[model samples]
Target: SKGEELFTGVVPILVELDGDVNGHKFSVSGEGEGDATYGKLTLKFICTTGKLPVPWPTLVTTLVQCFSRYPDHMKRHDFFKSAMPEGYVQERTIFFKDDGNYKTRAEVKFEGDTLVNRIELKGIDFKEDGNILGHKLEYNYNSHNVYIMADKQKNGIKVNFKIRHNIEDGSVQLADHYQQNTPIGDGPVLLPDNHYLSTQSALSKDPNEKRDHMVLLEFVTAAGIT
Candidate 1:
């Protein structure tokens, strides 16, 4: 192996994001200070966040792609900069309208501040005329919680999300409210460290399945010392 060298200077970094989900492309040019030795440079470049032009569903699909398909060489820290940045308080607004045009909007702003994940819904809703196959479609989206975290015992990342949005049947309704027990307990879903947590039960355990209901989150960097 070659001898290590010291690094101290301004550095250039370009973040390029492109993919099959949106068929979109973006480039970001940034600069940061780099001071390192032993062939490892801590170049801390920064980028500004803003509203993404793509829709929410496409961006969700984009997340699945970035998390599942990104190469290790392209990753900085532990993430690839995608169009759908996680810093936004409201990643985007989603508008829902029923058959009679009764409409409302919802915001999607997931948090990444804590090591243990706390995912939940904000509002409530119910269906009038709909049946999910055999069961009636009903739900309340307000304050619903989905917890995810690294298993304390290291078995797996855990997920405890219960609820449903009745769909894939016939008539899509608002949020469906139903009292039912989920296969998962109130504890973490034991998800693998790098794995995703899909809201859809069927897709949650299926690694290869890709959809917007899935989420992958990680802190960019910790402020504490190692």
Candidate 2:
């Protein structure tokens, strides 16, 4: 476990796109592995409005060029990284089962980055009576900022997820709840939008009460926010 190289300590790099081509703002952030010489990278795209449609060749090409700056080894194992460039080299492996349940695992190894550059899914059995009914998936990035979901079917199910992290402030929405009559400035600003201002008093109170109060005044009186 000590020497095994898994994706760990992912650092985020933000890439803001220029211009407003289609009434939407585009931004890209990359999470790179920590231990490797050339970090293994994963990219995330965000749009201010609407989903990314198909056949956006320009966007794809631009992202590929961004990834091309990394060394060949760095780009080899990553799906988007290796596939971004025309002449980039890489390798892959796949395993399947005949009983409808299957497990697929993949990893990339950079030549110069001597960390263990491989991922494995020994056997992700999905059968109702399969040996490995449930498995835990862990990412090398921020564990607090990931979401996982599953789609069940007749005999098997599909698993899907999106990993995201804020590039600008690195802040994440942890939980949401209703707020009560917590004080604000001149009077009291009741926050019923399941959002609350973070403060020492707010956090110290009951978890439920944390939502109802705006601690801005206390901090403002103390010169926290101008």
Q: Of the candidates shown, which would achieve the greatest TM-score relative to the real structure?
A: 1
**Candidate 2 lDDT by residue in tens digits, 91-205:** 1111212212112222222333322222222222234332112111111122211111111221111222222222223432111111111111122111111111211111112
Query: What's the TM-score of each model vs. the native?
Result: 0.22, 0.20
Clashing pairs in 2: 179-211, 179-212, 180-212
Which regions of candidate 1 are displaced past 4 Å? 1-69, 73-92, 99-114, 124-226
Collision count for each candidate, in order: 14, 3
Q: Which RMSD does model 2 reach against the true structure? A: 23.4
lDDT of 1: 0.23
lDDT of each: 0.23, 0.22
